[PDB]
């Protein structure tokens with residue numbers, strides 16, 4: 604059981620919502636595509652495709668509290684082009700539905716892969732642009748005290764008009780480093796040393812992630828530290844080994860990666876900086 608308070612800024616009548624296909628039961632919760640009717644006073648007879656999150660029926664009291672949390676946090680953080688945004692919620696006379704934006708070309712990684720050489724092909728500008736947009740989004744969240752914790756291509760989603768949007772930021776978390784993702788990869792490959800070892804998570808480690816995220820981008824979908832089992836990665840990093848520069852990657856960019864991977868967290872750049880460098884570099888980068 605439960606009753607929620609309703610904020611009318613955000614309440615959508617649940618009959619204005621046409622639920623459709625699901626897509627995986629994530630880290631608690633389960634999400635389904637849907638069509639919202641209205642959403643906009645201007646054009647109230649238009650459907651808008653949205654993603655709607657709701658509880659599975661095998662759902663604890665906390666599992667709920669969690670959903671309410673991340674909803675309320677998405678409210679606090681506010682809108683930005685380069686993040687997945689809240690658009691509404693259905694709170695009354697039914698189970699809770701937390702509606703957000705549909706990003707119609709999947710995750711960054713899938714979209715990169717689908718655009719390798721012999722569905723279109725990405726120019727050099729198209730890639731740096733992509734890194735730039737993620738940095739913007741990251742900067743925004745950071746400006747709002749948000750620390751991401753699992754930043755990587757899989758957690759960047761892409762809209763029809765090709766805009767990078769960061770996903771799963773307000774995320775309530777709690778520990779197997781062998782836990783495999785859908786694609787078969789290990790979340791530790793994105794983790795900064797101090798996050799790995801001493802559980803210390805900050806903007807600085809979100810920057811380390813962004814390093815690897817750049818690496819993913821300039822390998823059109825790469826898989827980090829290829830065939831280097833978890834155990835080995837412990838040492839390699841400890842000592843100071845770093846990933847290899849990709850082909851089709853300028854020294855400039857490879858040097859960014861390397862600063863995002865500074866051993867001393869405080870000496871890494873910040874997103875503010877990285878946005879400013881990526882803007883310049885995009886302007887100097889040819890189609």
Ligand SMILES: */C=C\C(=O)Nc1cn(CCO)nc1Nc1cc(N(C)C(=O)Nc2c(Cl)c(OC)cc(OC)c2Cl)ncn1
Nearest residue numbers: 634652654655656687701703704705706707709770771772
């Ligand atoms: C819109 C058509 C469509 O097919 N969209 C689509 C398909 N896929 C498959 C990816 O392999 N992804 C999308 N876009 C999409 C997915 C999602 N979520 C799966 C999702 O969980 N969204 C979401 C996010 Cl990202 C979030 O971030 C904090 C918070 C949410 O709810 C609280 C939700 Cl639901 N979202 C948007 N677009």
